[PDB]
RNA sequence: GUCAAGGAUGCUGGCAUAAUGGUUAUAUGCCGCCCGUCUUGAAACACGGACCAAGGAGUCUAACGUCUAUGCGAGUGUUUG
RNA sequence: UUGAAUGAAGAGCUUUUAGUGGGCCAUUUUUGGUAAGCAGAACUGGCGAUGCGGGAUGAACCGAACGUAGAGUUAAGGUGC
RNA sequence: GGGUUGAUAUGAUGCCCUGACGAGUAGGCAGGCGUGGAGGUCAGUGACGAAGCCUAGACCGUAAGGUCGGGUCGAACGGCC
């Protein structure tokens, strides 16, 4: 359990994909503003894709929070993990992608001992 | 190549973007253009007035 | 203009030092409301006298109700209108129970038959024809016959449903 | 934080305007006028009904 | 060819005002102009020396300099997006006093007199000008003035 | 502390005195509105009895609502609308009727609907849409204290004194009316009437002088 | 839609903090922000504003300028406050005894002030010995005496110092600068 | 003391997982012309573009202008040596 | 009530520099022409640079100018399908 | 536009209160995302698997992008100033 937070409203859950990224393979989905002079997306015609603008900004009380209600703090070892000793209801640890299987064991054990939430307690688990 | 020669379209709009400014009148205007015979006298009348005021004040 | 309203409008032409107590010109105006009534008063006094709104005043405006609103009356209406290609005078006759209903019938009649808008039309006179045989038009002299009755053939009944189960009859 | 409306919310209509209680008690907005008996002049009536 | 001379498009405007041609009457020369006097510019076309430009006719300015036969007038001229001060050496045949300023100084004298009278009393004076207020309530009598007018007229032609 | 309890008791006593002042002022205002209305009615009756006609006093106050939007306005009526503080559609202001404002209204006639507000619609406008201008910052009125803090030097202590200075165009009408932020009205709740808005009210549209019919429209927009 | 009579989202055009990363100047701005907020003396607002100023807006105030300011009637025992640098002046041969509260003093200025029995003060010692700015005299150096201000507003008949690299004969003293060659300006 | 007075609390039920929700494919309703570019005007019956990966275009220098930061301040610049 | 009304969004000032220097349309006034989706001027408002609702469709017309949403109400236009 | 220092409270390029506003080409300015290499630092990650690459699996950010899980892989590579 985390701190009590307001209900998280995201205001645009859909990814802002680039124009014609569905149409050409050279055009990746990473968002680029269309700066063309005759561009319908830039001119905002009805029926075209929405562009990212600041009105879609998340509520500051519920910003950066995961659905559990925690901000994710990236953790590489036990010394990174114990920064969240007094912040267990606010921050959840998340073990980095390059940590060993044998070091994830001691990170997870110490986080269980401290009450710190881990958002990926299943990476590199021998089953 | 034939084209537009002259128009005063948009000129009043551009003129009023930063306003039409009145020339900011001052006390003690410049004596540029005022009569030189008046100016030469007025220098001495001012000098004597300031001399007499300093004598009466000290 | 749901029904018209007749107003007396009395105006003065503002008193000056040389002439105090001016002459108080008065009209009968058919209008929707007092705003249009005062506007039409000034429109017609600018046609009759040297006065406008700036150099005059409205001293009074009173609605004139019908004296007998449930007595069926024959009205002679003298009217001047602007056609597309001139100005003409007409005299029409309207059978109705009140002057404002007669003038509404006149305005619908003129807009229908002569395509004349409200702006084109001046109501010069509405006067009740006090006795029959001074009534001049056949379309109103029809109804002034003794013991008049007429039927209404081909009654069309308005249905509230989109489907009927009876093949309806137009008797009446 | 929130604009409560007088013309609803009699608590705010009494926070503003302490006379609202006296107005509602004496009814003061449904008060009868004195029945005077003024009759208009014949010149006014015949100008009004004049053709 | 375009013509843009000093007295171009001044045909009717330096013209000499029918049955008032000829000599300039002496009160024009007998008026006294001091520095700070506000003056209207209207060019006398009979006097050709010291004429203003055709821009400056109708314009009103403040006298800054007084010479033998002329005065110097400051006219603000709208040039582009600002005004510029224009100093004009105009002979006194093209210059007369501004009656707006004359009645303004009579208003100043009247205001001073009314404030002195209200200080002789103890009452306020309220000495600003006010606009044309809406008219107050009237009772228009009908004695001798019975409201009597008929309707619009028919269309007769009288050609 | 005990001194703080003394200041609290002093503040509540001052608040009761201010409320007694406001209550007696509102009672006096109601009495003079009632007597002025009865006096005009009896003046009309008395003139009709004497055979004369009582010409009512010309209206000292208009309420002006901008009914036309932002684009395609000529510069002179645009400047007059900005000087009457009608900078968006369905903004209303009270305007003192003199000759120096009647020729403003004649200039902005195709873009506003104006008329003569009654006491009821003035009261409902200031009660519901009434906002102040305090450090320019558009403060909602909601309390007689913020009207006393800004218009109290002109003798206005409450929202009813503020209404009184509008309906009777007082000596400090300009200061009271400029304290009032322009009323952000809604669209009318039963429509405008009038299939097309931008003809005159005489011609079957909405704009122009709408003399005593502005109360119906403004109460629909309020 | 709003018919805007002004520019929307327009910044005030004034510095609200110094552009410097000087931690001691940020500390002085912190102190005079407190003293501008909590004292309601106008001196602290003026000094807080002047702490934001740039190097061309903080010209050096000479000790001769300070002494001329103390030569005013009844200003001889005031505290001269210079939000900026106080520089020396060897042209003045008699410096009085006074208290000067400045950001920086040059070594010659500090020596000249303390040689005459004076006292050189930082703006926080001024804040503890005159928190409402009592008995103070703010002095400012000359801004239009900068060399860059000579060339500002250059045009015909302005007399405003052409942007030039080498100065002499053959360097802009010819057609356009005398009646004989062409015209005069 | 209470209150409807400077912003929702009380009571109850079901579920406690794919049930709500997310992603995703599809279907339906309505909308949606191909981008870049020159142009007064581009979907143009204007031009470039078959597709993809990598490469690919305001850089550095000499001398300066405004502004800003810093050091010292009638001085200042150690670095030719 | 210090010399009319209304407004004032802070007022005044300085430095520096980008782009631009092909325009076009509409009401009204206009010149050349028989006239033009022609060529040229005046004032304004637009399009360019601008989406939205309407005119089926359209750069300019009408209404209205646009952060992300909810509810209400309308504008211009409409209400047989 | 303001409030907030004698534990503000140790985030005062902070926290908070209040009101208004938000279109945009060319253009200007600001705040940020990413890349190769350098100084410092985390006594950072790593053959118990670094980087890469694949992934209609998950999370965060309006977005630039960041993070994680699985597969493949085999020697190095990140966070912050
Ligand atoms: Mg997302
Ligand atoms: Mg996205
Ligand atoms: Mg991309
Ligand atoms: Mg385009
Ligand atoms: Mg609010
Ligand atoms: Mg000519
Ligand atoms: Mg003439
Ligand atoms: Mg409805
Ligand atoms: Mg589950
Ligand atoms: Mg679902
Ligand atoms: Mg379609
Ligand atoms: Mg272009
Ligand atoms: Mg194109
Ligand atoms: Mg090709
Ligand atoms: Mg190719
Ligand atoms: Mg590449
Ligand atoms: Mg060029
Ligand atoms: Mg050209
Ligand atoms: Mg012609
Ligand atoms: Mg466009
Ligand atoms: Mg459209
Ligand atoms: Mg339409
Ligand atoms: Mg069509
Ligand atoms: Mg259609
Ligand atoms: Mg129109
Ligand atoms: Mg809606
Ligand atoms: Mg923008
Ligand atoms: Mg690197
Ligand atoms: Mg290791
Ligand atoms: Mg790996
Ligand atoms: Mg794929
Ligand atoms: Mg190997
Ligand atoms: Mg990297």
From Swiss-Prot, chain A:
Keyword Nucleotide-binding (UniProt): no
Primary location: cytoplasm
Compartment(s) of residence: Cytoplasm
Keyword annotations: Cytoplasm, Phosphoprotein, Ribonucleoprotein, Ribosomal protein
InterPro entries for the chain: Ribosomal_eL32 (IPR001515), Ribosomal_eL32_CS (IPR018263), Ribosomal_eL32_sf (IPR036351)
GO molecular function terms noted in the UniProt entry: structural constituent of ribosome
GO cellular component: cytoplasm; cytosol; cytosolic large ribosomal subunit
Entry similarity comment: Belongs to the eukaryotic ribosomal protein eL32 family.
Protein name in the entry: Large ribosomal subunit protein eL32
Organism: Saccharomyces cerevisiae (strain ATCC 204508 / S288c)
UniProt gene name: RPL32
Swiss-Prot record, chain B:
Subcellular locations according to the entry: Cytoplasm
Disordered: annotated segments: 1-36
Sequence position, cross-link Glycyl lysine isopeptide (Lys-Gly) (interchain with G-Cter in ubiquitin): 51
Biased composition (Basic residues): 1-25
Domain of life: Eukaryota
GO molecular function: structural constituent of ribosome
Matches recorded under Pfam families: Ribosomal_L29e (PF01779)
GO CC terms, sorted: cytoplasm; cytosol; cytosolic large ribosomal subunit
UniProt keyword terms in alphabetical order: Cytoplasm, Isopeptide bond, Ribonucleoprotein, Ribosomal protein, Ubl conjugation
GO terms under biological process: cytoplasmic translation
Keyword Cell division belongs to the record: no
Note in the entry: Present with 51100 molecules/cell in log phase SD medium.
Subunit structure: Component of the large ribosomal subunit (LSU). Mature yeast ribosomes consist of a small (40S) and a large (60S) subunit. The 40S small subunit contains 1 molecule of ribosomal RNA (18S rRNA) and 33 different proteins (encoded by 57 genes). The large 60S subunit contains 3 rRNA molecules (25S, 5.8S and 5S rRNA) and 46 different proteins (encoded by 81 genes).
Family affiliation: Belongs to the eukaryotic ribosomal protein eL29 family.
Main function: Component of the ribosome, a large ribonucleoprotein complex responsible for the synthesis of proteins in the cell. The small ribosomal subunit (SSU) binds messenger RNAs (mRNAs) and translates the encoded message by selecting cognate aminoacyl-transfer RNA (tRNA) molecules. The large subunit (LSU) contains the ribosomal catalytic site termed the peptidyl transferase center (PTC), which catalyzes the formation of peptide bonds, thereby polymerizing the amino acids delivered by tRNAs into a polypeptide chain.
Curated annotation (Swiss-Prot), chain C:
Pfam families registered for this protein in UniProt: Ribosomal_L18A
GO aspect biological process, one term: cytoplasmic translation
Predominant subcellular localization, coarse grouping: cytoplasm
Compartment annotation: Cytoplasm
InterPro entries cross-referenced by the UniProt entry: Ribosomal_eL20 (IPR028877), Ribosomal_eL20_dom (IPR023573), Ribosomal_eL20_eukaryotes (IPR021138)
GO cellular component: cytosol; cytosolic large ribosomal subunit
Superkingdom of the source species: Eukaryota
Sites of Phosphoserine modification: 32
One annotated GO molecular function: structural constituent of ribosome
Record cross-link Glycyl lysine isopeptide (Lys-Gly) (interchain with G-Cter in ubiquitin), residues: 125, 131, 149
Keywords, ordered alphabetically: Cytoplasm, Isopeptide bond, Phosphoprotein, Ribonucleoprotein, Ribosomal protein, Ubl conjugation
Family per similarity comment: Belongs to the eukaryotic ribosomal protein eL20 family.
Purpose: Component of the ribosome, a large ribonucleoprotein complex responsible for the synthesis of proteins in the cell. The small ribosomal subunit (SSU) binds messenger RNAs (mRNAs) and translates the encoded message by selecting cognate aminoacyl-transfer RNA (tRNA) molecules. The large subunit (LSU) contains the ribosomal catalytic site termed the peptidyl transferase center (PTC), which catalyzes the formation of peptide bonds, thereby polymerizing the amino acids delivered by tRNAs into a polypeptide chain.
Miscellaneous note of the record: Present with 54300 molecules/cell in log phase SD medium.
Annotated protein name in UniProt: Large ribosomal subunit protein eL20A
UniProt lineage: Eukaryota, Fungi, Dikarya, Ascomycota, Saccharomycotina
Gene: RPL20A
Curated annotation (Swiss-Prot), chain E:
Keyword vocabulary terms for this entry: Cytoplasm, Isopeptide bond, Ribonucleoprotein, Ribosomal protein, Ubl conjugation
Protein origin, superkingdom: Eukaryota
A Pfam family that the UniProt record links to this protein: Ribosomal_L21e
Secretion signal, residue range per the UniProt entry: none
Cellular localization per UniProt: Cytoplasm
Linked residues for Glycyl lysine isopeptide (Lys-Gly) (interchain with G-Cter in ubiquitin): 31
Gene3D superfamilies: 6.10.250.3260, Ribosomal protein L21
Main location: cytoplasm
Name of the molecule in the record: Large ribosomal subunit protein eL21A
Note: There are 2 genes for eL21 in yeast.
InterPro entries: Ribosomal_eL21 (IPR001147), Ribosomal_eL21_CS (IPR018259), Ribosomal_eL21_sf (IPR036948), Translation_prot_SH3-like_sf (IPR008991)
Subunit structure: Component of the large ribosomal subunit (LSU). Mature yeast ribosomes consist of a small (40S) and a large (60S) subunit. The 40S small subunit contains 1 molecule of ribosomal RNA (18S rRNA) and 33 different proteins (encoded by 57 genes). The large 60S subunit contains 3 rRNA molecules (25S, 5.8S and 5S rRNA) and 46 different proteins (encoded by 81 genes).
């Amino acid at each position: 359990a985390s701190l009590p937070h307001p209900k998280i409203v995201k205001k645009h859950t859909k990814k802002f994909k680039r124009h014609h990224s569905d149409r050409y393979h050279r055009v990746a989905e990473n968002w680029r503003k269309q700066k063309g002079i005759d561009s319908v997306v830039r001119r905002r015609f009805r029926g075209n894709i929405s562009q990212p603008k600041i009105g879609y900004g998340s509520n500051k009380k519920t910003k950066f929070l995961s659905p559990s209600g925690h901000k994710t703090f990236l953790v590489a070892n036990v010394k990174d993990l114990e920064t969240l000793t007094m912040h267990t209801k606010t921050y959840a640890a998340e073990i980095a992608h390059n940590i060993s299987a044998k070091n994830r064991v001691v990170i997870l054990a110490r986080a269980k001992a401290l009450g710190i939430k881990v958002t990926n307690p299943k990476g590199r688990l021998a089953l | 190549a034939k084209s537009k020669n002259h128009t005063a379209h948009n000129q009043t709009r551009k003129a009023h973007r930063n306003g039409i400014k009145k020339p900011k009148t001052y006390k003690y205007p410049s004596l540029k253009g005022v009569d030189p015979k008046f100016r030469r006298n007025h220098k001495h009348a001012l000098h004597g007035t300031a001399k007499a005021l300093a004598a009466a004040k000290k | 203009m749901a029904h018209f309203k007749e107003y007396q409008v009395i105006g003065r032409r503002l008193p000056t030092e040389s002439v105090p107590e001016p002459k108080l010109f008065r009209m009968r105006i058919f209008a929707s409301n007092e705003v249009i009534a005062k506007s039409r008063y000034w429109y017609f006094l600018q046609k009759l006298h040297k006065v406008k709104k700036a150099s005059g005043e409205i001293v009074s405006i009173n609605q004139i109700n019908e004296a007998h609103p449930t007595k069926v009356k024959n009205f002679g209406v003298w009217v001047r209108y602007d056609s597309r290609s001139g100005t003409h005078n007409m005299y029409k006759e309207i059978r109705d129970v009140s002057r404002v209903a007669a003038v509404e019938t006149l305005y619908q009649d003129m807009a229908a038959r002569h395509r004349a808008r409200f702006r084109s039309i001046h109501i010069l006179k509405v006067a009740e024809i006090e006795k029959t045989a001074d009534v001049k038009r056949q379309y109103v002299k029809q109804f002034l016959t003794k013991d008049l009755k007429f039927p209404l053939p081909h009654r069309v009944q308005k249905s509230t449903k989109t489907f009927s189960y009876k093949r309806p009859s137009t008797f009446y | 934080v929130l604009k409560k409306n007088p013309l609803k919310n009699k608590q705010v209509l009494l926070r503003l305007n302490p006379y609202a209680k006296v107005f509602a008690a004496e009814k003061l907005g449904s008060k009868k006028a004195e029945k005077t008996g003024t009759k208009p002049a014949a010149v006014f009536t015949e100008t009004l009904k004049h053709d | 060819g375009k013509s843009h001379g000093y007295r171009s498009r001044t045909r009717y405007m330096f013209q000499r005002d029918f049955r008032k041609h000829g000599a300039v009457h002496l009160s024009t020369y007998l008026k006294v102009y001091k520095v700070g006097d506000i003056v209207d510019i209207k060019a006398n076309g009979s006097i050709q020396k010291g004429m203003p430009h055709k821009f400056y006719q109708g314009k009103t300015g403040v006298v800054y300099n007084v010479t033998k036969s002329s005065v110097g007038v400051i006219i603000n001229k709208m040039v582009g997006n600002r005004y510029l001060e224009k100093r004009l050496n105009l002979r006194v045949e093209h210059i007369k006093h501004s009656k707006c300023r004359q009645e303004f100084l009579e208003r100043v004298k009247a205001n001073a007199a009314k404030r002195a009278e209200a200080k002789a009393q103890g009452v306020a004076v309220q000495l600003k000008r006010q606009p044309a207020q809406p008219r107050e309530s009237r009772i228009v009598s009908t004695e001798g003035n019975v409201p009597q007018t008929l309707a619009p007229v028919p269309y007769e032609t009288f050609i | 502390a005990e001194q703080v309890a003394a200041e609290r008791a002093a503040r509540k006593a001052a608040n009761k005195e201010k409320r007694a002042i406001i209550l007696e002022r509102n009672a006096a205002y109601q009495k003079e509105y009632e007597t002025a209305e009865r006096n005009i009615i009896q003046a009309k009756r008395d003139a009709k009895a004497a055979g004369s006609y009582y010409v009512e006093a010309q209206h000292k106050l208009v309420f002006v609502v901008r009914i036309k939007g932002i684009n395609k306005i000529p510069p002179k009526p645009r400047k007059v609308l900005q000087l009457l503080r009608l900078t968006r559609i369905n903004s209303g202001t009270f305007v003192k009727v003199t000759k120096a404002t009647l020729e403003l209204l004649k200039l902005i006639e195709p873009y506003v609907a104006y008329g003569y507000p009654s006491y009821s619609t003035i009261r409902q406008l200031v009660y519901k849409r009434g906002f102040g201008k305090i450090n320019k910052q558009r403060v909602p009125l909601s309390d007689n204290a913020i009207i006393e803090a800004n218009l109290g030097k002109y003798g206005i202590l409450s929202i009813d004194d503020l209404i009184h200075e509008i309906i009777t165009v007082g000596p400090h009408f300009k200061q009271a009316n400029n304290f009032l932020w322009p009323f952000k009205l809604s669209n009318p709740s039963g429509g405008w009437g009038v299939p097309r808005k931008f003809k005159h009210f005489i011609q079957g549209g909405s704009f122009g002088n709408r003399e005593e019919f502005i109360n119906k429209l403004v109460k629909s927009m309020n | 839609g709003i018919d805007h009579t002004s520019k929307q989202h327009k910044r005030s055009g004034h510095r609200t903090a110094p552009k410097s990363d000087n931690v001691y100047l940020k500390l002085l701005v912190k102190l005079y922000t407190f003293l501008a907020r909590r004292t309601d003396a106008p001196f602290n607002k003026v000094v807080l504003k002047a702490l934001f100023l740039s190097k061309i807006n903080r010209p050096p105030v000479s000790v001769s300028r300070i002494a001329r300011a103390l030569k005013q009637e009844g200003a001889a025992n005031k505290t001269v406050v210079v939000v900026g640098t106080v520089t020396d002046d060897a042209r003045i041969f008699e410096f009085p005894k006074t208290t000067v509260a400045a950001l920086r003093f040059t070594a010659g200025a500090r020596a000249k002030i303390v040689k005459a029995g004076g006292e050189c003060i930082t703006l926080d010692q001024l804040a503890v010995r005159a928190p409402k700015g009592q008995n103070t005299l703010i002095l400012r150096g000359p801004r239009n005496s900068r060399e860059a201000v000579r060339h500002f507003g250059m045009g015909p008949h302005k007399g405003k110092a052409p942007r030039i690299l080498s100065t002499g004969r053959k360097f802009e003293r010819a057609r356009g600068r005398r009646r004989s060659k062409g015209f005069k300006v």
